[PDB]
């Protein structure tokens, strides 16, 4: 969550939050951002290796009771590799929103068509009046 | 306890046992024979290796808890040799009386000077009379 995301979490959102709860709205945007970014990796089969380890460890415990330590060492050898495989899955699951994607979160869960924005402290002040009359039927 | 010892346990001993308990006297002679033959090997330090095994096994149990199975295998390797050393001590402790030594047991725990014997069913019948007069003072 770099600085431009933290700033965008309030500087972009303050325009569309009439609530007293704004100071904690930045949490909701990064929370829902991670929730939507988490749609990329909900299906990593980390447990496919863990279930293999629990099997190989269960054999290891039996190789030990039989005092078969060539077999027991071979299993500790494989599991160590298997454990390193699981821990390395984290590196394939970096969660990185663009600040534009964080700004788009403001529309996704609000339904307010504002993806065109913006640095819009002044832009809305002057253009929303013109934006209105484009849809008005009557006096200007 | 070969056949000549079993025969000697009664055939030699019947001459000097006025007891009703003769049929089980052969047990006493082979029992005391082993007791006297056991004076050759009362000091084998079989436990000197067993105490080494209990140490190496105690390390082995710790090598296993640490999952150090190069060390654990090395200890199972040494103990196996150490266990074979103990079991092979039995072969250096064969217990073999001569039938003459079994016959000498009849004197050792009785105190009756008869090592010169013998096949003496008839020898005593004829010679004990002559053996007497050699120690007599008087008429023949």
Automatic annotation (TrEMBL), chains A, B:
UVR domain segment(s): 50-85
Coiled coil: 46-99
Residues spanning the signal sequence: none
Name of the protein described by the UniProt record: ATP-dependent Clp protease, ATP-binding subunit
UniProt source species: Streptococcus pneumoniae
Gene: clpL
First-to-last residue of the parent protein present: 282 to 421 of 701
